[PDB]
From a paper:
The modification of proteins by ubiquitin-fold modifier 1 (UFM1) is implicated in many human diseases. Prior to conjugation, UFM1 undergoes activation by its cognate activating enzyme, UBA5. UBA5 is a non-canonical E1 activating enzyme that possesses an adenylation domain but lacks a distinct cysteine domain. Binding of UBA5 to UFM1 is mediated via an amino acid sequence, known as the UFM1-interacting sequence (UIS), located outside the adenylation domain that is required for UFM1 activation.
We determined the crystal structure of UFM1 alone at 2 Å resolution. The crystals contained two molecules of UFM1 in the P212121 asymmetric unit with RMSD of 0.14 Å. Superposition of this structure with the UIS fused to the UFM1 structure did not show significant conformational changes (RMSD of 0.49 Å). Unexpectedly however, we found that the interaction between the two UFM1 molecules in the asymmetric unit mimics the UIS binding. Specifically, the spatial position of Ile 55 and His 70 of UFM1 overlaps with that of UIS residues Ile 343 and His 336, respectively, which are involved in binding to UFM1. In addition His 70 of one UFM1 molecule, similar to His 336 of the UIS, enters a negatively charged pocket on the surface of the other UFM1 molecule and interacts with Glu 38 & 39. Using gel filtration we have found that UFM1 exists not only as monomer but also as dimer. However, in the case of the E38A mutation that prevents interaction with His 70, the dimeric form is not seen, suggesting that the dimeric interaction is mediated via His 70. To address this question we superimposed the structure of the UFM1 dimer on our previous structure of the UFM1-UBA5 complex. As shown Fig. 5D, binding of UIS to the UFM1 dimer positions the dimer in an orientation where one of the UFM1 molecules within the dimer clashes with the adenylation domain, thereby preventing activation of UFM1 dimer by UBA5.
Numbering used by the authors: 4 to 77
Write the structure that this text describes.
Amino acid sequence: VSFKITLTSDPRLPYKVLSVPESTPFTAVLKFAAEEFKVPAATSAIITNDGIGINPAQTAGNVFLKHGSELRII
């Protein structure tokens, strides 16, 4: 599965596209995205477009199924 993750704290709203196995934990996606954007992995969070936090203790496939592939990192 491909996630498009947008960093909102940079006003240009850069995004990265990440390819992740469905059964990989979403914790890994949060970590990778944080690394890609050079933001601290331990304080960062992935949210929906309404600002709701995604609990990363679930598979990437589950997150895609429930909330789609376009998310934001804060």
